[PDB]
Amino acid sequence: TIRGVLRSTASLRQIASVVNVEATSFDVLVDKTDMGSGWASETAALSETATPQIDRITIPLHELAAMPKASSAFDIETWLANRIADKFARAEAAAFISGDGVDKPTGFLTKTKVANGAWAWGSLGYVATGAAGDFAAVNASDAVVDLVYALGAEYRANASFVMNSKTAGAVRKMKDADGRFLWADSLAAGEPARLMGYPVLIAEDMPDIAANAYAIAFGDFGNGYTIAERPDLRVLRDPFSAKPHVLFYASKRVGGDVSDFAAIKLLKFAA
Amino acid sequence: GYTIAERPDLRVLRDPFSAKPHVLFYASKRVGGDVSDFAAIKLLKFAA
Amino acid sequence: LANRIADKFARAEAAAFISGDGVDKPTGFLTKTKVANGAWAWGSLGYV
Amino acid sequence: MMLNEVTAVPGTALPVAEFRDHLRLGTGFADLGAEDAALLSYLRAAIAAIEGRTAKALISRGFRLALTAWRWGDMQTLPIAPVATVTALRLVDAAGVETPVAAGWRLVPDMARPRIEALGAMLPMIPTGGRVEIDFTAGFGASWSALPVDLAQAVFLLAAQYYELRHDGAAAMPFGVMALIERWRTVRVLGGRP
Amino acid sequence: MMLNEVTAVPGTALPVAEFRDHLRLGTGFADLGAEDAALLSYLRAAIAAIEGRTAKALISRGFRLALTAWRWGDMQTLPIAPVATVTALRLVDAAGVETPVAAGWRLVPDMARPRIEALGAMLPMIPTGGRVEIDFTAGFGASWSALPVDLAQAVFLLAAQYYELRHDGAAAMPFGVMALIERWRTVRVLGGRP
Amino acid sequence: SVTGRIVAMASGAGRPVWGPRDTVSLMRTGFAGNPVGFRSVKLIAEATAAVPLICPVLDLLRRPNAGQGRAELFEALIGQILLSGNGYLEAVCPEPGVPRELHVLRSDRMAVVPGADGWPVGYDYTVGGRKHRFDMTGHPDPICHIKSFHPTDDHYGLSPMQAAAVALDVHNAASAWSKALLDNAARPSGAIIYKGADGQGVLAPEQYERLIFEMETHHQGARNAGRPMLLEGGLDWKPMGFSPSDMEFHETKAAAAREIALAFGVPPMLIGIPGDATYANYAEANRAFYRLTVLPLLTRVSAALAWWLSGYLGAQIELKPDLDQVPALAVERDQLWARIGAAGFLSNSEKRVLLGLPPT
Amino acid sequence: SVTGRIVAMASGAGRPVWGPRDTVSLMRTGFAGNPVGFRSVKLIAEATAAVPLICPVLDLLRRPNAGQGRAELFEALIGQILLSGNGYLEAVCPEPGVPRELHVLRSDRMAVVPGADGWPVGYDYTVGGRKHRFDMTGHPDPICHIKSFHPTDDHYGLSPMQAAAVALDVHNAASAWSKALLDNAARPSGAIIYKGADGQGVLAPEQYERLIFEMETHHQGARNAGRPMLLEGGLDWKPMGFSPSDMEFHETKAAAAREIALAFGVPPMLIGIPGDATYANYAEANRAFYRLTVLPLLTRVSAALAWWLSGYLGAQIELKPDLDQVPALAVERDQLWARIGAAGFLSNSEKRVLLGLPPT
Amino acid sequence: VALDVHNAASAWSKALLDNAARPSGAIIYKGADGQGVLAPEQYERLIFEMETHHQGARNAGRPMLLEGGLDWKPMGFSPSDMEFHETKAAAAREIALAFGVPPMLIGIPGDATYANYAEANRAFYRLTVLPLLTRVSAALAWWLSGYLGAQIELKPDLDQVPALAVERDQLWARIGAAGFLSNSEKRVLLGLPPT
């Protein structure tokens, strides 16, 4: 049996809202503001209090394609089908997190972030850690806990952290003034998988800790990020074009950006 | 006065393998025709 | 696309059946070496 | 598949000054009198007789291999054998848009079977009507000194023969012209569909 | 299929001044021109001998290929092999009218198979009782220098022979007249229907 | 079951799985192409339709739809199983129980969907580029999918034509060898060699029409067979032969014509191919045909109609071949009636219960 | 039927679908051309017409139309099914019920129309440039369309001659090989070679008429077989041979003549082709013929007449072959009467109900 | 090994029918020299007299005048039938040998070992079917009894399996003809419930 390198599988697919769509695009419809109702006066005109301005966000439903040429110990049809499904499960994971606008789903990091407390609708909110290189030196994890408690109590019913491996490394490297590992205290524990009472998703397409990078996200992505897709995978078992190489054609179409800008909060490693 | 010879089918075929982002349909029919009997068609010339 | 192809072919060959030349497409009767009637021969079509 | 040469030899690359020495040096009448530019016209006739029997190139001239359909799925053996560095694999269409390609193929050099041998199983397909066209530089070296000297001696054994006797007159050497060529001919045993 | 020539070679394009260097006539005589009327009479008699044994052309004069029914449904391989830029497939009618046709025909260049394959799966049809002449200019180059030199040598090995013996008098080389010709002959193995 | 849930996510849930690539080309080259592959399927598919069944529901089977009778249905059904290893039956149910339409869907244009738990959720009828997406996420499950046994695949059948796909291409090309040999061959019955004074010399067209007319009139044909044929100086007659005359791949075609009949399981005696006498006298080879490749095939499809159609009814129904008054099994019925009829020790009602009779 | 709408659009509704072009040429080259393809269809079509039927409706079948009897109708009907895979029956109804005219429309000039839901709406009888456009958008549906089984096509039959179309062209051309060999062949029984003093030399017309008259009188013919034939200087007699004498494609013709008989399903013993003894003694081969390729064909056509003609009546009628007093099945009738007749344990009326008699 | 012989001998004849150039002859044209081509004028003349007048079934045996230089050498095809025909037919029997089917049941050609299908079908259900089925059913009799409380036996019927009728005629007519022992004394032998 032919082996391959085992890549990361966690993909933000299982915590975001997966919607089977059949058309060319998926239009989510979110109001931007409140009703604005006031307490009425007993002798006043009292008319036209306000109306929420709605907004259509378009999931463009892009397509993803990989085209390998095939060029009896192991059987290529099953193996290449088990590799290209993995690559389509992994290459859309980068687009879900840091994809840009052109021909691919725009990830939640590329949505013009604004510091929380001055949060408006068109952006995502972040909280600063302190010094630019890493977590704060005096009190580590204060950035983590106020990232949790700067989101909103309705979305924190089912919210999760999104990191890569070597940011969860730097989280588990946090220790008290005796060096006793605030998260998973002993050297015998392991991954506790319940950071601050919330699950952790190790998604490798997140950036690592840098001068300004947003290496930790937290949110109810079921309301936040909408993955609209078509469930099938095209299989053109092509017997033409090149006699020498089969050149199988496999494509899945998928789209997605943020549906709710209030659900996702980011951790900026700066001041 | 006019004989039509033809293959009486509209064969239509998809093949995405030519242009790979596309489907590129192809339909074809072949028809041939000329006059059988020259003594059986007359015309009006609007000249003289 | 099948409906529009089947609509297009029955009109393109309809114009071929009348005014098409000999080479590459079926020749129509109006393209053939016509002569005045009374001066009629087999290698022509007659007009008045 | 026309396979015309882009440029011929310059003529100054040929060893006319050395061929006068293979003609009569160390033994002879004197340097004697030989129409110099005649002696260049017999070297070009002896090289072109050995470029054809061996399918080699010997001076490293520039070629242009313009053929319509790929024979195999990916292989494309090049005929002129000692090759180096495809200049370009530009691809013209039926109208002449001439869109070159710069990747997808890796020339695998060899004196036996030079190839194009694209990556994987996909070699650049041909526009319908638009012949593919491959420019390459095939041969041993730029000067006469870079040649295998046994093949160079087969030129001098042959170009002297065209100098010594003009018409087709009759006249079995151990390493003659023919015995020096046979380790450079192409040994093929395929008469088949691939 | 008649295949006549529109124009012959100019005669001034033939290397009479170089063939005279080949035959060792003489260098500095004041006459120098008593053979010019006959030397090109043997060069045209040796090229036309090798144009028939090789089915090549060698001076790229213009041809006229007047034929009536197509040999195969679409291909129509041309006899004279090294071609370039087929001018006109003017389709004559039963009598008189000659209508040149662009017609959607291509040209596949090759030294072995100089086809005229059509792209619309059928060459332009032929008016019953009328011919289809094809004007094309086929050959290696315009001047003598654009030839393959071994084929140019095979003219000089042969036309020197006609100059040295006049009647059919009997008289083995490694690369003789014949061994230079044989990589330019047409190698065919079909006696079949298609 | 539990293994199936893991198997799905390997191939991909919710996406069509196609299986065999060439099954559309084996039909034209193996069932419309050669008579041995043609007759072998027609011999079986017309045998399974002739076998009666034992149960209402059979009223549907007798008249499934317009223009497609009872016997015509199983010829279409088994004719897809022998060709592509898969049988399909669409049911149209205006009414809740016993749906009054059956349709043999051809297995070229049908594709499976593995779904979540490995057992199928979708079947996709794809003609052109247009799909249907039948749904299996319900109880009546509108398509019975009859699989031939396939050990390596989890969703399709093996289609005995795929196992004989080498012997089809031998039999197709050896038969086309002799066709194009009779169509592309120049044998002469001789050659009048004319050398001449030189080693080469043509003869003038005056002399050549003399040579045709003395050959056309006086030497060719049945009526001129053996004229003494004076040859003067220069002329000579070399008679040619034709050294392989008969038997161009005659046994390798006849061995391949037996391996096609071997794979579908028909005996060589029934189909009519030549060969050594294996079976004796057609009371066996027809009985072997309805016991090794018809009745095991028919009791396997009828066991799937007994379960798929019972999903439309409330009560489950069995549906089996008759294995009685099928006249190829009369030698198994003589042998069993004369055994117990001659057993005089056990009484009269004690042997009506053995032979299958209503007791008295 | 639910998927019927999808396949209809691809073909194109309201437009005629033709199928196979070369169908009319297989008739002239494979049924009017060779005896094996000729006898095989005539052997079947004259057998299915001879089989009686079991039901009124049969009064139409007994006298369908003028000049075309009962037995003559099924020869025309089955003779189109074996030739082109399709049978057609126009019914002309001056009267509302049980229309008193039946006409076998030939399937060369008939074309289908797919219509809306995939099942046909039009049939087109196309002679010359003239069409008719029969209509199927009604309840009586005036043409029954009997299909042979075709797995790949959705509208026509397969026509066993198409499956044997290579073996027909072998048998047509191997038989025409020996014909044109007997018509184009120059064998001489010798050659009187006259060289001369030179390598070449003719003989004068004085000497040449001398050479004929001693060859015409004294050497040719049966009565001059073996004269001692003095040869002087220069003359020499080289006797020629004819090296392949018999057997020009003799076994490949005899193998292709069996594969044609294989596809239509006739046994080699019935048609008369030579070959190894597969069946024994004509009690088998005639019983095999009416069980593998006649009675399955006749019970499939009669099942289409049982449904198309019942659409003109009110009550539905069954119509099956008799499978009784057809004298090729007497070995299956001896074997079943002597089995139950020798079973003496069960009483008299208990075996009249088994053999099919009205009990007394 | 015998599978790979039978797979490759069958693919030998397939690729022989697909890669083989036999000609039915060769019109050799030497010329005055040892070598000489013929002009495309002469070559299209040579096709048209070969296409029309010599090839095909209908032109089989024209007398074929050969002038100077021309000569017709008819080629043959010396192994015509039987390309690994017996080694395929021997390997097709050794495959049937290993699984245990008799050669008569599967349909392979070969010498008559069994006689008349009353033996070969009875040999098939006694040497390679019923020993296989009584071994699998003995594993279902023990694995499934581990889910039940009481152990269950589970064996093939070896009765009303219609390939064993020649072993059932032979055992009923033996005891049925033994008239000395009484009626209930042979119902207990043939397996009947006594009355």
PDB file of C-alpha atoms in Angstrom, chain F residues 73-172:
ATOM      1  CA  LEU F  73     -39.153  -6.955 -18.254  1.00  0.00           C
ATOM      2  CA  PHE F  74     -36.861  -9.728 -17.098  1.00  0.00           C
ATOM      3  CA  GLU F  75     -35.149  -9.799 -20.487  1.00  0.00           C
ATOM      4  CA  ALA F  76     -34.373  -6.148 -19.884  1.00  0.00           C
ATOM      5  CA  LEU F  77     -33.483  -6.799 -16.250  1.00  0.00           C
ATOM      6  CA  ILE F  78     -31.216  -9.815 -16.623  1.00  0.00           C
ATOM      7  CA  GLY F  79     -29.874  -8.310 -19.832  1.00  0.00           C
ATOM      8  CA  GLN F  80     -28.443  -5.499 -17.759  1.00  0.00           C
ATOM      9  CA  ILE F  81     -27.084  -7.869 -15.094  1.00  0.00           C
ATOM     10  CA  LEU F  82     -25.205 -10.003 -17.589  1.00  0.00           C
ATOM     11  CA  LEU F  83     -23.942  -6.941 -19.427  1.00  0.00           C
ATOM     12  CA  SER F  84     -22.984  -4.585 -16.608  1.00  0.00           C
ATOM     13  CA  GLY F  85     -23.418  -6.448 -13.328  1.00  0.00           C
ATOM     14  CA  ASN F  86     -26.186  -4.190 -12.047  1.00  0.00           C
ATOM     15  CA  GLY F  87     -29.961  -4.280 -12.267  1.00  0.00           C
ATOM     16  CA  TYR F  88     -32.224  -1.332 -11.603  1.00  0.00           C
ATOM     17  CA  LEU F  89     -35.981  -1.029 -11.192  1.00  0.00           C
ATOM     18  CA  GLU F  90     -37.701   2.320 -10.814  1.00  0.00           C
ATOM     19  CA  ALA F  91     -41.106   2.198  -9.130  1.00  0.00           C
ATOM     20  CA  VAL F  92     -43.693   4.924  -9.648  1.00  0.00           C
ATOM     21  CA  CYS F  93     -46.124   4.995  -6.717  1.00  0.00           C
ATOM     22  CA  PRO F  94     -49.215   7.193  -7.066  1.00  0.00           C
ATOM     23  CA  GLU F  95     -50.738   4.788  -4.508  1.00  0.00           C
ATOM     24  CA  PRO F  96     -48.906   3.900  -1.271  1.00  0.00           C
ATOM     25  CA  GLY F  97     -48.791   0.097  -1.654  1.00  0.00           C
ATOM     26  CA  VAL F  98     -47.783  -2.092  -4.656  1.00  0.00           C
ATOM     27  CA  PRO F  99     -46.638   0.620  -7.103  1.00  0.00           C
ATOM     28  CA  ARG F 100     -48.125   0.054 -10.529  1.00  0.00           C
ATOM     29  CA  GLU F 101     -45.007   0.890 -12.589  1.00  0.00           C
ATOM     30  CA  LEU F 102     -41.725  -0.944 -13.078  1.00  0.00           C
ATOM     31  CA  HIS F 103     -38.934   0.307 -15.319  1.00  0.00           C
ATOM     32  CA  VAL F 104     -35.596  -1.330 -16.060  1.00  0.00           C
ATOM     33  CA  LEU F 105     -33.173   1.568 -15.849  1.00  0.00           C
ATOM     34  CA  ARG F 106     -30.088   0.942 -17.922  1.00  0.00           C
ATOM     35  CA  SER F 107     -26.884   0.700 -15.927  1.00  0.00           C
ATOM     36  CA  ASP F 108     -24.721   2.755 -18.264  1.00  0.00           C
ATOM     37  CA  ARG F 109     -26.306   5.992 -17.135  1.00  0.00           C
ATOM     38  CA  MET F 110     -26.820   5.168 -13.449  1.00  0.00           C
ATOM     39  CA  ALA F 111     -24.360   6.061 -10.680  1.00  0.00           C
ATOM     40  CA  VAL F 112     -24.423   5.420  -6.945  1.00  0.00           C
ATOM     41  CA  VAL F 113     -23.905   7.843  -4.064  1.00  0.00           C
ATOM     42  CA  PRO F 114     -22.337   6.375  -0.894  1.00  0.00           C
ATOM     43  CA  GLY F 115     -23.933   8.789   1.533  1.00  0.00           C
ATOM     44  CA  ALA F 116     -23.165   9.035   5.230  1.00  0.00           C
ATOM     45  CA  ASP F 117     -23.149   5.508   6.673  1.00  0.00           C
ATOM     46  CA  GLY F 118     -21.742   3.744   3.599  1.00  0.00           C
ATOM     47  CA  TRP F 119     -25.013   2.263   2.445  1.00  0.00           C
ATOM     48  CA  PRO F 120     -26.363   4.279  -0.490  1.00  0.00           C
ATOM     49  CA  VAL F 121     -28.461   7.427  -0.189  1.00  0.00           C
ATOM     50  CA  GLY F 122     -28.502   8.449  -3.822  1.00  0.00           C
ATOM     51  CA  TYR F 123     -28.693   6.992  -7.296  1.00  0.00           C
ATOM     52  CA  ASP F 124     -28.053   9.352 -10.204  1.00  0.00           C
ATOM     53  CA  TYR F 125     -29.507   8.723 -13.638  1.00  0.00           C
ATOM     54  CA  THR F 126     -27.181  10.753 -15.880  1.00  0.00           C
ATOM     55  CA  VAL F 127     -28.056  11.063 -19.579  1.00  0.00           C
ATOM     56  CA  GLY F 128     -26.287  13.821 -21.467  1.00  0.00           C
ATOM     57  CA  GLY F 129     -25.397  16.136 -18.625  1.00  0.00           C
ATOM     58  CA  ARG F 130     -28.777  15.907 -16.949  1.00  0.00           C
ATOM     59  CA  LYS F 131     -29.371  14.114 -13.649  1.00  0.00           C
ATOM     60  CA  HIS F 132     -32.251  12.945 -11.537  1.00  0.00           C
ATOM     61  CA  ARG F 133     -30.974  12.082  -7.997  1.00  0.00           C
ATOM     62  CA  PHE F 134     -33.266   9.367  -6.794  1.00  0.00           C
ATOM     63  CA  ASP F 135     -33.454   9.360  -3.003  1.00  0.00           C
ATOM     64  CA  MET F 136     -32.830   6.407  -0.689  1.00  0.00           C
ATOM     65  CA  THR F 137     -33.370   8.253   2.603  1.00  0.00           C
ATOM     66  CA  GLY F 138     -36.817   6.750   3.077  1.00  0.00           C
ATOM     67  CA  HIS F 139     -38.502   3.447   3.726  1.00  0.00           C
ATOM     68  CA  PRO F 140     -39.926   2.316   0.324  1.00  0.00           C
ATOM     69  CA  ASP F 141     -36.548   2.987  -1.425  1.00  0.00           C
ATOM     70  CA  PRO F 142     -37.758   3.421  -5.018  1.00  0.00           C
ATOM     71  CA  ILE F 143     -34.977   1.440  -6.782  1.00  0.00           C
ATOM     72  CA  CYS F 144     -33.997  -2.143  -6.172  1.00  0.00           C
ATOM     73  CA  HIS F 145     -30.289  -2.448  -6.926  1.00  0.00           C
ATOM     74  CA  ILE F 146     -29.463  -6.033  -7.866  1.00  0.00           C
ATOM     75  CA  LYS F 147     -25.710  -6.598  -7.621  1.00  0.00           C
ATOM     76  CA  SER F 148     -23.750  -9.399  -9.101  1.00  0.00           C
ATOM     77  CA  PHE F 149     -21.044 -10.537  -6.708  1.00  0.00           C
ATOM     78  CA  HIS F 150     -17.971  -8.315  -6.798  1.00  0.00           C
ATOM     79  CA  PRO F 151     -15.232  -8.963  -4.205  1.00  0.00           C
ATOM     80  CA  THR F 152     -13.209  -5.760  -4.661  1.00  0.00           C
ATOM     81  CA  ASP F 153     -15.957  -3.192  -5.221  1.00  0.00           C
ATOM     82  CA  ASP F 154     -18.481  -2.126  -2.600  1.00  0.00           C
ATOM     83  CA  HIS F 155     -21.158  -0.704  -4.891  1.00  0.00           C
ATOM     84  CA  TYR F 156     -21.369  -2.599  -8.191  1.00  0.00           C
ATOM     85  CA  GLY F 157     -21.329  -6.031  -9.820  1.00  0.00           C
ATOM     86  CA  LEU F 158     -18.668  -7.852 -11.760  1.00  0.00           C
ATOM     87  CA  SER F 159     -20.465  -8.349 -15.111  1.00  0.00           C
ATOM     88  CA  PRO F 160     -19.142 -11.653 -16.649  1.00  0.00           C
ATOM     89  CA  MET F 161     -18.432  -9.806 -19.890  1.00  0.00           C
ATOM     90  CA  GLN F 162     -15.735  -7.927 -17.973  1.00  0.00           C
ATOM     91  CA  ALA F 163     -14.202 -11.279 -17.046  1.00  0.00           C
ATOM     92  CA  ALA F 164     -14.341 -12.374 -20.699  1.00  0.00           C
ATOM     93  CA  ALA F 165     -13.107  -9.043 -22.062  1.00  0.00           C
ATOM     94  CA  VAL F 166      -9.907 -10.577 -23.410  1.00  0.00           C
ATOM     95  CA  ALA F 167     -11.713 -13.467 -25.102  1.00  0.00           C
ATOM     96  CA  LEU F 168     -14.137 -11.051 -26.729  1.00  0.00           C
ATOM     97  CA  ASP F 169     -11.302  -9.065 -28.306  1.00  0.00           C
ATOM     98  CA  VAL F 170      -9.703 -12.272 -29.540  1.00  0.00           C
ATOM     99  CA  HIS F 171     -12.949 -13.471 -31.082  1.00  0.00           C
ATOM    100  CA  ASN F 172     -13.788 -10.060 -32.507  1.00  0.00           C
TER     101      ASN F 172
END
